[PDB]
């Protein structure tokens, strides 16, 4: 069969974890906010000419239950490291997480990607390059994504597909 | 005079049975008032044919969104939203009736029910009421939830008001 991979959606509240999953696999964007409590997605793709079936859990981003998100990156391939591109405090939470990550998994070197969402909102305050420098410094790619206009919404989860691959 | 309020609970259109909460009017007076009155259904609108959206078992009940009966939306007799009435009360076991919210100051008109202790939730949600009879009818209400809490049949409040 087609090779799987397990996918993790993570960042704080309201950065668009869950408009950016909807959109890959439904192709249609939620206006309205209903916060995630946990929710898993299988879609078959096809990436650099090889098909493959991305398995996707989509996490809550509430800090109250930061302590249980560790079976799951335990349990997780490849992780979607998602901040808003108008929310400082999301572009800043994004270092606990891979922080969290990184200790979980005990190795530097996991499969991440930085994506910047929302792109598509003029009230911009995380700049494309404050973010393009914090993601070399962790040696990960970086993308802009829209879950409203889905710019860089495959672009984003067939990158961690990517990274995946030259990790395995 | 603690105000009392019932649902009639029924699954895919069938009845379950009579829930009936006391509300804490004499600590949280407006937000006992808002699920009165919309209980009622005086203003206009209110619970009455809404779905209880989210069921985790072990944990709550949640439900009251009548304006998009998606687990996203309800409003308030006072607004689409008003703010943390005051945290006296807590999360001290199953029948706790509890404000759900989005963050501080977000009360709407979605609401849960405890099954269990959920202390955590203490001084974040605003606690107004607790069960007066028909503890069962919740603790039967669980086996249709799950553990994201999507329910496996459609739990509706049939019919709901105020009791003398
Ligand atoms: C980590 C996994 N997780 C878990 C969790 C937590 C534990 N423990 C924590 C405590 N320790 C001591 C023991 C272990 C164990 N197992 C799980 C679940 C079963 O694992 C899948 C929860 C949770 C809540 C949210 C997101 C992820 C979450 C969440 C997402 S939005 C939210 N909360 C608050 C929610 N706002 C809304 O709906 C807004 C839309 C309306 C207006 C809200 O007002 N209410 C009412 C109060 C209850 C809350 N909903 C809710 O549903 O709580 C679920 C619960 C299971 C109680 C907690
Ligand atoms: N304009 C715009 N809005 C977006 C975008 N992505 C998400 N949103 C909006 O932002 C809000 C929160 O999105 P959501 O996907 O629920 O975020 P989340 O990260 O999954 N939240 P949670 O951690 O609670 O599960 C929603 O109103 C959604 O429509 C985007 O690219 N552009
Ligand atoms: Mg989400």
Redesign the pocket.
């Known amino acids: 069969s087609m090779t799987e991979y397990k996918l993790v959606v993570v960042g704080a509240?309201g950065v668009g974890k869950s408009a950016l999953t909807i959109q890959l696999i439904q192709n249609h964007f939620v206006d309205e906010?209903?916060?995630?409590?946990?929710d898993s997605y299988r879609k078959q793709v096809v990436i650099d000419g090889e098909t493959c079936l991305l398995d996707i859990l989509d996490?809550?981003?509430?800090e109250?239950?930061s302590?249980?998100?560790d079976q799951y990156m335990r349990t997780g391939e490849g992780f979607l490291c998602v901040f808003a591109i108008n929310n400082t405090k999301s572009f800043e939470d994004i270092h606990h997480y891979r922080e969290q990550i990184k200790r979980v998994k005990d190795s530097e070197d996991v499969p991440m990607v930085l994506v910047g969402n929302k792109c598509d909102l003029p009230s911009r305050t995380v700049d494309t390059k404050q973010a393009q420098d914090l993601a070399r410094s962790y040696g990960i790619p970086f993308i802009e994504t829209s879950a409203k206009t889905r710019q860089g919404v495959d672009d984003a989860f067939y990158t961690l597909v990517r990274e995946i691959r030259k990790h395995k | 005079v603690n105000p009392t309020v019932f649902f009639d609970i029924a699954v895919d259109g069938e009845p379950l049975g009579r829930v009936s909460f006391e509300l804490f009017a004499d600590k949280v007076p407006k937000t006992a008032e808002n699920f009165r009155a919309l209980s009622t259904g005086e203003k206009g609108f209110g619970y009455k044919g809404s779905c209880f959206h989210?069921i985790?078992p072990?944990?709550?009940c949640?439900g009251?969104?009548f304006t998009r009966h998606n687990?996203?939306?309800?409003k308030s007799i006072y607004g689409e939203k008003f703010e943390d009435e005051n945290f006296i009360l807590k999360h001290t076991g199953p029948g706790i009736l509890?404000?759900?919210?989005?963050g501080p100051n977000?009360?709407?008109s979605?609401?849960?029910i405890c099954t269990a202790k959920?202390?955590?939730?203490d001084g974040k949600?605003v606690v107004f009421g607790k069960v007066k009879e028909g503890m069962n009818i919740v603790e039967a209400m669980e086996r249709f939830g799950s553990?994201?809490?999507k329910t496996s049949k459609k739990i509706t409040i049939a019919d709901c008001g105020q009791l003398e």
Not at chain 2, 71 to 74: A, D, F, K, L, P
Not at chain 2, 118 to 121: C, F, H, K, Q, R
Request: charged share 15%; proline share 2%; aromatic share 12%.
């Open positions: 509240v906010y209903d916060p995630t409590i946990e996490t809550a981003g509430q109250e239950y302590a249980m998100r | 989210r985790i072990g944990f709550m949640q009251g969104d687990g996203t939306g309800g509890s404000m759900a919210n989005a977000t009360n709407g979605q609401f849960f959920t202390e955590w939730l949600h553990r994201n809490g």
